Design a protein around this nucleic acid. Sequence first.
DNA 1: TTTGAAAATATGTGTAATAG
DNA 2: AACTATTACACATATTTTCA
Lengths: 280, 53, 52
Amino acid sequence: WPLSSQSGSYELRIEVQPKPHHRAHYETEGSRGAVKAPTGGHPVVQLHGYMENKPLGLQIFIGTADERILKPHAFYQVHRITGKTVTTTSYEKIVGNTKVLEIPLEPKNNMRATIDCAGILKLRNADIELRKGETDIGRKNTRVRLVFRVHIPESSGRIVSLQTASNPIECSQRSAHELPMVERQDTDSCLVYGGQQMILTGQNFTSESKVVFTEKTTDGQQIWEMEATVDKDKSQPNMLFVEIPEYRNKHIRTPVKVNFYVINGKRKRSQPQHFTYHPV
Amino acid sequence: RRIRRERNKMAAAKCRNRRRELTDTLQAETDQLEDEKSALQTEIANLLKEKEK
Amino acid sequence: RKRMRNRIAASKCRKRKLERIARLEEKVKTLKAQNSELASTANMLREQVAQL
DNA sequence: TTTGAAAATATGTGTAATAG
DNA sequence: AACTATTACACATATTTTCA
């Protein structure tokens, strides 16, 4: 369902996130192994607070990423990966104009599930953009999140439905190499004056990297653009040192929400990051 | 009369910028409405949880 | 010379450019409409919970 | 399988012919 | 006439999909 849901009154959390990149494969290709973790291990999600003793069905499907509302991603589909040295997790594949996997959640294992049968398929853009109803162009649109749900039946016969999504994931071979990307920011806010160092940690940061700041209305209109001065004198491998810029109207009396992004050339920019300035 | 090109240059550019800004705006609009829509949906689900005590 | 294939691309590229805008408008109508109705169902439940 | 790229498209820019 | 908006064309670039 593209219908919203939450972390719940209990909690379904992702204990081990996926790697930032995962070149997915087409139908015209040999399948790739299912998504892995940065440690070489695998992604892990479990249900906390399940004081009961019956196996449920955790389902996963490839959702959208970027700064939009979570929605099953139309240009990508989960793929049941073949096998491992040890049959780790079993699967079940179904649809609804988009495939969905269901790996059993065992109480025996603390309602924890190691995801290693989750691969990703890529569909031809022109193939999708065809069906009437679709308004999103696939070009340049290559990011994703692994979405997981669980339906907890209750003693009252109720269904508390939970859902969670991983961190964005790049699937585009080229994009994964070209487009920069923040995964950690040192600070989330500060006051109007700015002039404070924010440590930005991510991938593909070069010496062409510039950090831009934006102000937009609910109207979707850019109201402000300010470039920050990142210490390009010397630094570590992949992490920029950003000097937060002063806000346009230092006289605000209520917190403003802004965005900033990293850019390496006209068409090589990161996804919009969040930031907020506080009044004085 | 090579200026003819300099101008037709902008002429074309103009029109092109027009069709872009237009479509970007639209993309903005739909994206926002989806924002609004989900907010209602989550609310509605919050009231149904609230209701059925 | 390979130009025969491009004329075909652009044509499609442009045609598609348009269809996109058209599809977006219809989607705005649809959403404005849906949202209105949902806005109501919201209020509706609101009063109800406020009387329970 | 996994990696890197050529081969194939898709989209931007400058022109030219043409409608308005 | 003289000028701008429009649309298709060839060529340059940008991304995607097919192959090795």
